[PDB]
Amino acid sequence: DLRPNPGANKRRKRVGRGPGSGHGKTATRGHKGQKSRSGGLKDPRRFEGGRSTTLMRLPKRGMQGQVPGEIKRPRYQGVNLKDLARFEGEVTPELLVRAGLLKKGYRLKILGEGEAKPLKVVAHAFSKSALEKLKAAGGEPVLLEA
């Protein structure tokens, strides 16, 4: 491939819009031609302007937090055995994060649909219907964290 032979494909549309001249976007220059759009509007993500904006709504979100903040709580991330049936042996956390799911998101919780594979699976939790699926010869090394 020659040096003066690449050039982008057929869509890198450098053609950005130039404000103008007699033919195209012009004078008032594309958009405009009125007034109050000469330095930037209010939002308008919020405007609106004068009347009460859809802020007539109402904080439901009971609990937004005290002042010290968020309470150091253990978070659990589900991961359907569906995906779990991608490899074999003895799947466990870390081996799951390193895989392509979970990752540092704390405690492991297998469940979801998918057909449970005959093998041992270590987790911090298991869903009811998941524990059932491992009926077809599997495992249940729950608890952990010691």
């Binding site: 020659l2 040096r3 690449p6």
Partner: protein, 49 residues
């Protein structure tokens, strides 16, 4: 990777010289012919997948 060779070519108007661990696309394309030694064809390998 041989500085002695590198030193010898270099000044040739038709020669563009590089150390193996400097192999980049732009240069390969700006030249017509590519000449690597086997020890440099390796570093190249250790970089391709």
């Amino acid at each position: 990777g041989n500085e002695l060779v590198r030193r010898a070519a270099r000044n040739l108007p038709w020669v563009v010289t590089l150390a193996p661990e400097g192999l980049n696309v732009y240069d390969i394309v700006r030249t017509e012919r590519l000449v690597m030694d086997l020890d440099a064809w390796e570093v190249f390998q250790n970089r391709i997948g």
